[PDB]
Short mmCIF file of all heavy atoms in Angstrom, two decimals:
data_model
loop_
_atom_site.label_atom_id
_atom_site.label_comp_id
_atom_site.label_asym_id
_atom_site.label_seq_id
_atom_site.Cartn_x
_atom_site.Cartn_y
_atom_site.Cartn_z
N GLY A 295 16.65 -15.23 -14.96
CA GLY A 295 15.58 -14.31 -15.24
C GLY A 295 14.60 -14.25 -14.07
O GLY A 295 13.46 -13.80 -14.27
N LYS A 296 15.05 -14.63 -12.86
CA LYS A 296 14.18 -14.59 -11.65
C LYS A 296 14.55 -13.48 -10.67
O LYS A 296 15.72 -13.17 -10.48
CB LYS A 296 14.18 -15.93 -10.91
CG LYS A 296 13.52 -17.09 -11.74
CD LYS A 296 13.39 -18.38 -10.98
CE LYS A 296 12.58 -18.25 -9.70
NZ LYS A 296 12.19 -19.58 -9.13
N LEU A 297 13.53 -12.90 -10.03
CA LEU A 297 13.75 -11.80 -9.10
C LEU A 297 14.68 -12.19 -7.95
O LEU A 297 14.51 -13.25 -7.34
CB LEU A 297 12.39 -11.36 -8.48
CG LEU A 297 11.49 -10.49 -9.40
CD1 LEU A 297 10.03 -10.37 -8.82
CD2 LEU A 297 12.14 -9.08 -9.63
N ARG A 298 15.63 -11.32 -7.63
CA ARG A 298 16.47 -11.52 -6.45
C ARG A 298 16.13 -10.65 -5.24
O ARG A 298 16.71 -10.81 -4.17
CB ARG A 298 17.93 -11.41 -6.78
CG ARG A 298 18.36 -10.20 -7.30
CD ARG A 298 19.66 -10.52 -8.08
NE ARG A 298 20.29 -9.28 -8.41
CZ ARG A 298 21.42 -8.82 -7.88
NH1 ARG A 298 22.06 -9.49 -6.92
NH2 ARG A 298 21.85 -7.64 -8.30
N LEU A 299 15.18 -9.74 -5.43
CA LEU A 299 14.57 -9.03 -4.33
C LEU A 299 13.04 -8.91 -4.55
O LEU A 299 12.54 -9.24 -5.63
CB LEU A 299 15.17 -7.63 -4.27
CG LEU A 299 16.60 -7.44 -3.78
CD1 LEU A 299 17.04 -5.95 -3.96
CD2 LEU A 299 16.81 -7.93 -2.28
N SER A 300 12.34 -8.41 -3.54
CA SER A 300 10.93 -8.13 -3.73
C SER A 300 10.67 -6.79 -4.48
O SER A 300 11.62 -6.05 -4.77
CB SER A 300 10.18 -8.27 -2.41
OG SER A 300 10.25 -9.60 -1.92
N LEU A 301 9.38 -6.50 -4.79
CA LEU A 301 9.00 -5.31 -5.55
C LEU A 301 8.04 -4.41 -4.77
O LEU A 301 7.00 -4.87 -4.29
CB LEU A 301 8.32 -5.71 -6.84
CG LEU A 301 9.15 -6.43 -7.93
CD1 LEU A 301 8.27 -6.71 -9.20
CD2 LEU A 301 10.45 -5.71 -8.35
N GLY A 302 8.45 -3.15 -4.63
CA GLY A 302 7.64 -2.12 -3.99
C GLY A 302 7.04 -1.22 -5.04
O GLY A 302 7.74 -0.52 -5.76
N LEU A 303 5.73 -1.27 -5.14
CA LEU A 303 5.01 -0.49 -6.15
C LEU A 303 4.58 0.87 -5.59
O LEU A 303 3.62 0.96 -4.80
CB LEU A 303 3.80 -1.28 -6.67
CG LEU A 303 3.95 -2.74 -7.07
CD1 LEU A 303 2.61 -3.30 -7.51
CD2 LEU A 303 5.05 -2.90 -8.13
N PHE A 304 5.32 1.92 -5.97
CA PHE A 304 4.95 3.25 -5.55
C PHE A 304 3.87 3.89 -6.48
O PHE A 304 4.16 4.17 -7.64
CB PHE A 304 6.12 4.22 -5.39
CG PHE A 304 5.68 5.55 -4.86
CD1 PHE A 304 5.11 5.66 -3.59
CD2 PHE A 304 5.76 6.69 -5.66
CE1 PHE A 304 4.65 6.91 -3.12
CE2 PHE A 304 5.32 7.91 -5.18
CZ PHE A 304 4.80 8.02 -3.94
N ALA A 305 2.67 4.10 -5.91
CA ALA A 305 1.54 4.85 -6.55
C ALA A 305 1.06 4.11 -7.79
O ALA A 305 0.85 4.74 -8.87
CB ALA A 305 1.90 6.43 -6.83
N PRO A 306 0.81 2.78 -7.65
CA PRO A 306 0.25 2.07 -8.83
C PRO A 306 -1.21 2.55 -9.16
O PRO A 306 -1.72 2.33 -10.29
CB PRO A 306 0.32 0.58 -8.41
CG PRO A 306 0.17 0.61 -6.89
CD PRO A 306 0.96 1.88 -6.48
N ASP A 307 -1.87 3.25 -8.19
CA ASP A 307 -3.22 3.83 -8.46
C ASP A 307 -3.16 4.82 -9.66
O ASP A 307 -4.18 5.10 -10.28
CB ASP A 307 -3.79 4.51 -7.23
CG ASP A 307 -2.84 5.53 -6.70
OD1 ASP A 307 -1.82 5.18 -6.02
OD2 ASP A 307 -3.04 6.69 -7.09
N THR A 308 -1.94 5.27 -9.99
CA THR A 308 -1.68 6.15 -11.15
C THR A 308 -2.33 5.62 -12.42
O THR A 308 -2.80 6.41 -13.29
CB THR A 308 -0.17 6.29 -11.44
OG1 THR A 308 0.55 6.50 -10.21
CG2 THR A 308 0.06 7.44 -12.43
N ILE A 309 -2.35 4.28 -12.53
CA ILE A 309 -2.95 3.57 -13.68
C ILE A 309 -4.38 4.04 -14.09
O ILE A 309 -4.75 3.96 -15.28
CB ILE A 309 -2.96 2.04 -13.41
CG1 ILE A 309 -3.01 1.25 -14.73
CG2 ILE A 309 -4.09 1.63 -12.46
CD1 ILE A 309 -2.64 -0.18 -14.58
N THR A 310 -5.17 4.50 -13.12
CA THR A 310 -6.49 5.08 -13.39
C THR A 310 -6.39 6.31 -14.38
O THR A 310 -7.30 6.57 -15.19
CB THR A 310 -7.19 5.48 -12.07
OG1 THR A 310 -6.41 6.46 -11.36
CG2 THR A 310 -7.44 4.25 -11.17
N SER A 311 -5.27 7.02 -14.35
CA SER A 311 -5.05 8.13 -15.30
C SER A 311 -4.83 7.66 -16.75
O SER A 311 -5.03 8.45 -17.68
CB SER A 311 -3.89 9.02 -14.84
OG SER A 311 -2.63 8.41 -15.08
N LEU A 312 -4.43 6.39 -16.94
CA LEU A 312 -4.10 5.86 -18.28
C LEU A 312 -5.32 5.54 -19.16
O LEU A 312 -5.17 5.35 -20.38
CB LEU A 312 -3.21 4.60 -18.17
CG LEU A 312 -1.69 4.75 -18.10
CD1 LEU A 312 -1.22 5.80 -17.05
CD2 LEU A 312 -1.05 3.39 -17.87
N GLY A 313 -6.51 5.45 -18.57
CA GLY A 313 -7.75 5.24 -19.34
C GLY A 313 -8.81 6.26 -18.94
O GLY A 313 -8.64 7.01 -17.98
N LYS A 314 -9.89 6.32 -19.71
CA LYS A 314 -10.96 7.27 -19.46
C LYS A 314 -12.11 6.60 -18.73
O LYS A 314 -12.91 7.28 -18.08
CB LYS A 314 -11.49 7.86 -20.77
CG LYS A 314 -10.37 8.42 -21.67
CD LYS A 314 -10.90 9.34 -22.78
CE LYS A 314 -10.84 10.82 -22.39
NZ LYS A 314 -11.66 11.69 -23.28
N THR A 315 -12.21 5.27 -18.86
CA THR A 315 -13.36 4.56 -18.28
C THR A 315 -12.97 3.60 -17.16
O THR A 315 -11.82 3.13 -17.10
CB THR A 315 -14.16 3.77 -19.37
OG1 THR A 315 -13.40 2.65 -19.84
CG2 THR A 315 -14.54 4.72 -20.58
N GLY A 316 -13.96 3.20 -16.37
CA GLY A 316 -13.76 2.10 -15.38
C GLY A 316 -13.46 0.75 -16.03
O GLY A 316 -12.72 -0.09 -15.47
N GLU A 317 -14.01 0.51 -17.24
CA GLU A 317 -13.63 -0.70 -17.98
C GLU A 317 -12.11 -0.66 -18.33
O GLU A 317 -11.36 -1.71 -18.23
CB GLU A 317 -14.49 -0.82 -19.26
CG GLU A 317 -16.00 -0.96 -18.96
CD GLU A 317 -16.78 0.34 -19.07
OE1 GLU A 317 -16.24 1.46 -18.77
OE2 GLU A 317 -17.96 0.24 -19.47
N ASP A 318 -11.66 0.52 -18.74
CA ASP A 318 -10.21 0.71 -19.02
C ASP A 318 -9.30 0.45 -17.79
O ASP A 318 -8.18 -0.03 -17.98
CB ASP A 318 -9.80 2.10 -19.53
CG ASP A 318 -10.42 2.48 -20.88
OD1 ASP A 318 -10.71 1.58 -21.71
OD2 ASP A 318 -10.60 3.72 -21.05
N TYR A 319 -9.76 0.83 -16.58
CA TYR A 319 -9.00 0.56 -15.35
C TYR A 319 -8.57 -0.93 -15.31
O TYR A 319 -7.38 -1.26 -15.13
CB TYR A 319 -9.77 0.99 -14.09
CG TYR A 319 -9.14 0.43 -12.87
CD1 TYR A 319 -7.90 0.91 -12.42
CD2 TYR A 319 -9.71 -0.66 -12.19
CE1 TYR A 319 -7.25 0.33 -11.35
CE2 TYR A 319 -9.08 -1.22 -11.07
CZ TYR A 319 -7.83 -0.76 -10.67
OH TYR A 319 -7.16 -1.36 -9.63
N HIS A 320 -9.54 -1.84 -15.45
CA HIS A 320 -9.21 -3.27 -15.33
C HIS A 320 -8.28 -3.76 -16.46
O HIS A 320 -7.39 -4.59 -16.25
CB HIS A 320 -10.50 -4.09 -15.24
CG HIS A 320 -11.30 -3.78 -13.99
ND1 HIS A 320 -10.85 -4.11 -12.74
CD2 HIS A 320 -12.46 -3.11 -13.81
CE1 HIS A 320 -11.72 -3.69 -11.83
NE2 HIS A 320 -12.70 -3.06 -12.45
N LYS A 321 -8.53 -3.26 -17.67
CA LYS A 321 -7.68 -3.67 -18.82
C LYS A 321 -6.24 -3.20 -18.64
O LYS A 321 -5.27 -3.91 -18.95
CB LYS A 321 -8.31 -3.17 -20.14
CG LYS A 321 -9.57 -3.92 -20.48
CD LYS A 321 -10.17 -3.53 -21.82
CE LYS A 321 -11.65 -3.94 -21.96
NZ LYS A 321 -11.87 -5.31 -21.51
N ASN A 322 -6.08 -2.01 -18.07
CA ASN A 322 -4.75 -1.48 -17.79
C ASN A 322 -4.06 -2.29 -16.66
O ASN A 322 -2.88 -2.61 -16.74
CB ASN A 322 -4.80 0.02 -17.50
CG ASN A 322 -4.93 0.83 -18.80
OD1 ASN A 322 -4.29 0.46 -19.79
ND2 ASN A 322 -5.72 1.89 -18.81
N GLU A 323 -4.84 -2.61 -15.63
CA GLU A 323 -4.32 -3.47 -14.54
C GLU A 323 -3.85 -4.83 -15.11
O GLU A 323 -2.87 -5.38 -14.63
CB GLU A 323 -5.30 -3.65 -13.40
CG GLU A 323 -5.57 -2.40 -12.54
CD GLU A 323 -4.40 -1.97 -11.64
OE1 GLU A 323 -3.21 -2.06 -12.05
OE2 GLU A 323 -4.66 -1.56 -10.50
#
C-alpha cells in the first residue's frame, strides 16, 4: 500500500472553488 512513484498535483488551487469562505479553504486542504 506504498507509493512506487512520486505525485504531481495539477491545479490543486482548484480547491478554493470547493468552499465559499477562506475558512473553508483550509478545511478543504
Side-chain angles (χ1 to χ4, degrees):
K296 294 186 58 167
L297 282 168
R298 60 203 191 110
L299 288 174
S300 298
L301 293 182
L303 313 178
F304 184 63
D307 54 283
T308 316
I309 204 164
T310 61
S311 76
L312 273 49
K314 309 196 96 195
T315 70
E317 298 98 327
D318 297 331
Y319 167 70
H320 295 293
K321 290 184 198 314
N322 282 321
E323 291 289 38

